[PDB]
Amino acid sequence: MAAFGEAAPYLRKSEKERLEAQTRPFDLKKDVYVPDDKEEFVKAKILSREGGKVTAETEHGKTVTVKEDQVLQQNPPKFDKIEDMAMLTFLHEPAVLYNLKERYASWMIYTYSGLFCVTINPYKWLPVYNAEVVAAYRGKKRSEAPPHIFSISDNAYQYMLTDRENQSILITGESGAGKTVNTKRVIQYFAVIAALEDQIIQANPALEAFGNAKTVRNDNSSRFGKFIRIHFGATGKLASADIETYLLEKSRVIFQLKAERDYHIFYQILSNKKPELLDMLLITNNPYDYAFISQGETTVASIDDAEELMATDNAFDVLGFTSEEKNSMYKLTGAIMHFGNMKFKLKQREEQAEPDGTEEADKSAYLMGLNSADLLKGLCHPRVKVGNEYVTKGQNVQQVMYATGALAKAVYEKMFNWMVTRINTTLETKQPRQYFIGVLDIAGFEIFDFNSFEQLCINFTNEKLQQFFNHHMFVLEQEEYKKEGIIDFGMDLQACIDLIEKPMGIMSILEEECMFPKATDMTFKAKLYDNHLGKSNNFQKPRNIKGRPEAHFALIHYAGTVDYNIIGWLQKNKDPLNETVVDLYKKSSLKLLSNLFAKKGSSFQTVSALHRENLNKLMTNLRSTHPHFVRCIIPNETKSPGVIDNPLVMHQLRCNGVLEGIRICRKGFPNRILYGDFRQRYRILNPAAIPEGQFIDSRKGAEKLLGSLDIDHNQYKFGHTKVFFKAGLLGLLEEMRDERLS
Template sequence: MSVENEKDPGWQYLRLSREQITQDQSAPYDSKKDCWIPDKEEGFVAAQIVSTKGDQVTVTVKGTEKTLKKDLIAQMNPPKFEKTEDMSNLTILNDACVLHNLRARYSAMLIYTYSGLFCVVINPYKRLPIYTDSVARMFMGKRRNEMPPHLFAVSDEAYRNMIQNHENQSMLITGESGAASQTEAAAGGTSADGKKKVTLEDQIVQTNPVLEAFGNARTVRNNNSSRFGKFIRIHFSKHGKVASCDIEHYLLEKSRVIRQAPGERCYHIFYQMTSDYKPELKPALLLDRPMRDYWFVAQAELTVDGMNDTEEFQLTDEAFDILHFSPEEKMNCYRLMSAHMHIGIMKFKQRPREEQAEPDGTDEAEKAAQMYGVDTEELLKSFTHPRVKVGTEWVNKGQNVEQVTWAVGAMGKAIYARVFNWLVKKCNNTLDQKGIPRDYFIGVLDIAGFEIFDFNSFEQLWINFVNEKLQQFFNHHMFVLEQEEYAREGIEWTFIDFGLDLQACIELIEKPMGIISMLDEECIVPKATDMTLAQKLNEQHLGKHPNFEKPKPPKGKQAEAHFAMRHYAGVVRYNVSNWLEKNKDPLNDTVAACLKASKGNALLNE
């Protein structure tokens, strides 16, 4: 460890000082008395054994004596392992010791900790100066055991393995939602200087502000939660030079653009766009109301603690330029976001004594139509009188207010998803550099973490299903490889496939008569509702499948639930409201045809 490293402002967030290490390791310790006991508030707390009688143990904890069963007592590590950088070094490896080590390091703002091959990160919910160029240089060419735990060490190891072994490398970012958003900050920690020639590396970094603006949002667990999954491949020549980059994306949470739960926010771009960075933009987008009026993006929070939407919009707008988006493309993108805000407050009313909706004023429809580049009357007619095929003929069918409302929401979701797809495609085109051979790649899979909220819906089921599958792959890959190594070395070992532990939950979701197939079937049953789905799921699985449970009554802010599922990360209570509509995701063909005929927004013709 060089003295220069210690002078860096980020070093205090990477490794303890020598004085602190000495202080931690000289703490009093009695291997026969010191232990951990369970605690409802803190998980585990330190205690001292006073006496043992049969299977009962009496301990003192925080000055109070307590008697509990012997099997609840967990051993404690000697103080020489306090705040250890790699938990595989712990002499005693139990839940209490692992959690204590992570908590102790986190209290010292050391957010990275190794656990053998893995790097555990706990979200600090603030920016730390550990992703700077100077910190990156510290890790270049260094072995992992020479430096403190860091994403840079993992990245450098992947790069060296690729060059030395001539093999592609991949990294997986996974965990509970909100646990590791700083990994993205690591990728976006530096920005291109506009005066310099923009490099491919600069452009790769600048995809982050764009995709975050359109794909990240505030949730109850995380102020900057990624609401989509992505697999990024950075391609290299055999000499290690960056050749190109491409991005695949998955599971964009479309429903967020029309519905936000309490304590959450829609995608950042809507609030960035209406900030003060470009004051001329709001009049150009016909946004003349307070933000709270725009229902589709204002059902819960409008601001995020510690996030300045004006500054963030500057980063997004400049990133567009660095990625070679034209001024017209940028403006068309902003127009579609503005149109989404306008359609959210269009009003419709029911005609007296008729199952027919009609516009209740046309102000917002006119603004939306201008942003879309379509005729106002045609747009409204596509909602209230869409063309449907009856037999061999096409007829205009009247819609009631509820049907029109669903159609507007479906259009909003479809356009947003289309814009997001276009953004990723455009980024990929810019990052597809010609002239440098693509011999190997380093891939990073970043999927939304496991989610257990007060209100868990259709989106949480899919995210948690993906995480179950990833965890199964992870368990199988890591533990099977380890056990094969034991066999090669002649170590006696009973083979266990840890991946099978998750199979029951996966089958409950994906197998015939599982949740997905029953949902698909219910979507084509006449007069089916979300409640008939809930009833059938309970009849089919409750008491018959070990992972399907009756939900416990709601506590505090928890919403009503229709069933509960036992996942590897915990029991999740699911509410099936709107599942049929979300699964069908119906887009009115007449609306689609109207938008495709746009003469004022080229993105709708992409």
């Protein structure tokens, strides 16, 4: 209830709408949720029952009969527009969809979903998210207060003060869904409860240009992860902040799908916004011309390349660095551009690929600062150290193309991590930094028609994050159930990670598949079918519906059956770091001298391997903290009023992992009702001859109730402070109460 503190009347939701919503006529014995084909879930009344086929009639109008297995049970109106979706007793997937769109009808932005804080995105002015309601959530807990990320930010600040532990906040959401507004909203609150906002808001647009590419859904789709630690003092005083970004996608730099784009910086220099870079970097003004920028899409609607450069020259004109590095970063990007155009023609009667067309790598060697001939000799003949004395190997045209892609993706990710440290030099102030309450952002677990290894690099990452959620829910639910005296849920996800992380798993089979002499992608699919078809329950053959182009294997993740396309994984998996060219990178007079300054994988380290190590390092960074999840979704394509398209919310219900934490709590008892709360409301179900009165102790006052409800012992579990019930009983507490209220 959001009175007492000057907040908006919808966030109250009491004495005007809730007390009349707890009595509206919705006969659940004749009202169900029917599955639509377009909305996919919508409320319907039923005229009469027939058994398996029920004659449904929805609010939009169809008199057809629908199978009983297709329709689902409908939530009561007393739990319609439910506040905490763990308190609801009929917790279907339309129990989040329909409740989210009708809480959107009252424009309830935030919503408790158990540990999740689900956030729809309407667009208006918000009186609630400013100072006088910071006064209405300072110290206010989860249960009594209405939903708010200043409330869970003050819970993270609360256990930050009390538990003496690094608290963390893992925002899951995509760009364009107000994600910059979401992160600004998170970091706005810590300065208020303190007694570098403009550096975060200034630091973001160049970050958006170096690391936020285009997937099919999002025209500024996130690829990497953010991790903004707002460092504190000893007793909760805001000290500083640092960022350390994870999982910048290498294959995104090199290999671009035609419905996808690269990172924006190359397109900015290809834009004619600044001509001095075009004279400076020897660029032919054309994205179609370059081999890196022609495998994908040149440009799409709703984005402008000169606006992207307008972001980067604003962030580059003023920040902590000097003016020469503004030239240097562009030197490295246009230095990446001239790599791939080199032919590397095979010698006659040999295998060693000699560049004879040496005009474009000459332009590269002018752009970097490397020598012209030494770069070509180093790419052509990599010299390695054996025992004491160096020997050279040859190469063929294929391995030198993987070298000239691998050095580019490596120098781009190390340049971007370097830039994260350079922004970190600005963002860090000399206050004593202790016990961060840092907030991570990451790309969403995204399911396209072209799930590739790029998509696997998103999917297994968010898979492991969801694995941290399942254990983290299980320890808390275990804590309340051991307080009350009443298989792990992470195992429900573990098998999929068992299919992906463990050796003789799909990432491992993809890694070792490269090592063979003549192993193509068809041989790789033949090997996956050899090792896992029927051997593991997750792995299954891909059904193709509705004319997908091609699907090669399917993994039933927590979002369900997700196909994949093998073709081209062996080319994009490789990262052979050519060592002598890294030596020439050290020798060149540029930033790179500072950038690129039992062994493992000198010639065979793959994108899957560094994904595995960076994800494990993010995990051991995250297992040392304490999470507080935030979800954030876009309404539809238009920044719009209430025209929310239910396929998008039903898809991001499963892609954010919200429906998982919805269904994990259902396997225990989610119906968490207090004894006197069971007597003030549901003693009406089957009372004695005397009304309530408060003359029996509420544990025995509910034992008097359950001793006459005709409910068996296996349905409920009795405790000490509360009593719990299985999902599917607090609608049974009203079907006979409406017989009492008939």
